[PDB]
Ligand binder design. Structure first.
Ligand SMILES: O=C(NC1CC1)c1ccc(N2CCN(S(=O)(=O)c3ccc(OC(F)(F)F)cc3)[C@@H](C(=O)NCc3ccc(OC(F)(F)F)cc3)C2)nn1
Length: 559
């Protein structure tokens, strides 16, 4: 079956969409080459629709069936609870698409009477009807990128049910999604890790092999490759859990009326077509993709005969580290792995490449790199090309955005040369200029939403990355060059200009005392020759990373 069928109605916007990077003096101080920066809009939705629409080939073999049996046996050990309306209401991210039934995300989060009454009626309908297709809205996602030399990218398409339904999905399945992937894949479940644990996992996996070979596997439009039978098997896996009788019913209804497919409506209420694949904006998107990718990859590793595989899976992101059998055999065994994945309806985007250096693997848009701490000890950390984070940071300084990628990037990429010298310096000077140091901000990290005050960044970074995050130096030539080439391309000031700017930022923060002085001391110790002694921050031990800062969860894409 075709992943999509279209009517000719266009994917339409809700409000005006700006494609060009807006400019103000502060955003320009970060990046001057504004013409290279763009936002994706509904104008390119037609281009994305052609890429994501294809027929699926699915031939399951004994290797696939063997892994599915292990997953179902592992799933039987899970006990998951039905969430109450209130609980599901509190997990709703701020700014998620309002309901067409007269209430929005704010009403849901406040447990407003009107929102709760509607959600309750949606839930009763899921218990009484297991068949009628649920309507979905299709929107073109607005995301910021820098133009590429070889290739603007078309907008990604987001398919989501109404807000009331989204809350019901958490009531029936939030507890399943929070427990099932870890129970099923153990150490291979990538979402349990911080950046420091992911790097430790990859380095340890690499060192455990006699002659390691690794690869990232890029599935072409993963969501579209997900078949009706893949979605029905995810439901069969969910049912292996010890569940409440009402959750079992709602899970079946959600699968048959929404997850497997259904009608697509644009923002103007016109019929856009029909979906027979993964919806990008459902609670089970991330969990379902993680499970389905793990099943197909584990079976494909066996079908290819790859020796001693260690896998790390994050949604559709897959990385495999195995025991090399020589370059000719590895290239042939990777083609056999690809052929098996293709047969399982997971064909490649870019064909995988065997890598013999851990640093040359890109996975979760990142790579392993090395630096040294204050004692000169070797430290492995995760980094990436800063182009996209910098372009988005410039947009976010010119325009107030509900969700700030800059904050999530400073958090996830805190040990990096670029996040420290550029992102930290820039945002703390902008927060000083605007008097917003104490204002809590929203950010999203792979669907997990957080509400964080910039003044809490130092204890957050210490708890997440460790004290070494404030003392890394002696970055690699490749890393330095990648950042430096990025600055020249984007019109971003050189690192030495950022160092001088940071010394002024640092002084202003120190003079404010309290939490601001801690920001100046810890985050900007790299900017001074005469180093301050960085002792554990007391607030780092008091906090709880996972629970104190949570603003909810979106199982799939934005809105
Ligand atoms: O969809 C999910 N589950 C469904 C499928 C079943 C889901 C999604 C996210 C998520 N989390 C918690 C763990 N962490 S976390 O980093 O420990 C962290 C914890 C607290 C915190 O709090 C703050 F914000 F307050 F600091 C901030 C961060 C984040 C993460 O995505 N990790 C993986 C990862 C790690 C490194 C990577 O690589 C590179 F580093 F390059 F990005 C890429 C991915 C966010 N948990 N679950």
């Amino acid at each position: 079956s075709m992943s999509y069928s279209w009517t000719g109605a266009l994917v339409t916007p809700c409000a005006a969409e700006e494609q060009k990077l807006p400019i103000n003096a502060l955003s320009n101080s970060l990046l001057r080459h504004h013409n290279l920066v763009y936002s994706t809009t509904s104008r390119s939705a037609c281009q994305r629709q052609k890429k994501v629409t294809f027929d699926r080939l699915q031939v399951l073999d004994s290797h696939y069936q063997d892994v599915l049996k292990e997953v179902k046996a592992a799933a039987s050990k899970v006990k998951a609870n039905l969430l109450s309306v209130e609980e599901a209401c509190s997990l709703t991210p701020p700014h998620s698409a309002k309901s067409k039934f007269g209430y929005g995300a704010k009403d849901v989060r406040c447990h407003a009477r009107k929102a709760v009454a509607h959600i309750n009626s949606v839930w009763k309908d899921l218990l009484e009807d297991s068949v009628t297709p649920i309507d979905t809205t299709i929107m073109a996602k607005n995301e910021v990128f820098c133009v590429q030399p070889e290739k603007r990218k078309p907008a990604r398409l987001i398919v989501f049910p109404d807000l009331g339904v989204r809350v019901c999905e958490k009531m029936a399945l939030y507890d399943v999604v929070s427990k099932l992937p870890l129970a099923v894949m153990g150490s291979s479940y990538g979402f349990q890790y911080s950046p420091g644990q992911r790097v430790e996992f990859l380095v340890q996996a690499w060192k455990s092999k006699k002659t390691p070979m690794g690869f990232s596997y890029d599935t072409r439009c993963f969501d579209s490759t997900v078949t009706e039978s893949d979605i029905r098997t995810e439901e069969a896996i969910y049912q292996c859990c010890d569940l409440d009788p009402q959750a079992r019913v709602a899970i079946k209804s959600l699968t048959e009326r929404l997850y497997v497919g259904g009608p697509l409506t644009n923002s103007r209420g016109e019929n856009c077509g029909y979906r027979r694949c993964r919806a990008s904006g459902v609670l089970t998107t991330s969990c379902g993709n993680t499970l389905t990718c793990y099943i197909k990859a584990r079976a494909a590793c066996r079908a290819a005969g790859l020796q001693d595989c260690t896998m790390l899976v994050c949604g559709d992101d897959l990385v495999v580290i195995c025991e090399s059998a020589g370059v000719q055999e590895d290239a042939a065994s990777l083609r056999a792995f690809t052929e098996a994945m293709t047969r399982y309806s997971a064909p490649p985007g870019d064909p995988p490449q065997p890598e013999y250096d851990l640093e040359l693997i890109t996975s979760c848009s990142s790579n392993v790199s090395v630096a040294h701490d204050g004692a000169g000890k070797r430290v492995y950390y995760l980094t990436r090309d800063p182009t996209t984070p910098l372009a988005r940071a410039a947009w976010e300084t010119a325009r107030h955005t509900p969700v700030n990628s800059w904050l999530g990037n400073i958090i996830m990429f805190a040990p990096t040369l670029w996040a420290r010298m550029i992102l930290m310096t820039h945002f703390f000077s902008v927060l000083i200029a605007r008097d917003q140091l104490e204002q809590a901000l929203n950010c999203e990290i792979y669907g997990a939403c957080y509400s964080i005050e910039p003044l809490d960044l130092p204890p957050i970074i210490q708890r997440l990355h460790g004290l070494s995050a404030f003392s890394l130096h002696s970055y690699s030539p490749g890393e330095i060059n990648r950042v430096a080439a990025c600055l020249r391309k984007l019109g971003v000031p050189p690192l030495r200009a950022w160092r001088h700017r940071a010394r002024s930022v640092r002084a202003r923060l120190l003079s404010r005392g309290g939490r601001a002085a801690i920001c100046g001391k810890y985050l900007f110790n790299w900017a001074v020759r005469t180093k301050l002694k960085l002792t554990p921050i007391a607030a780092a031990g008091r906090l709880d990373l996972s629970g104190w800062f949570t603003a909810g969860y979106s199982g799939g894409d934005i809105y």
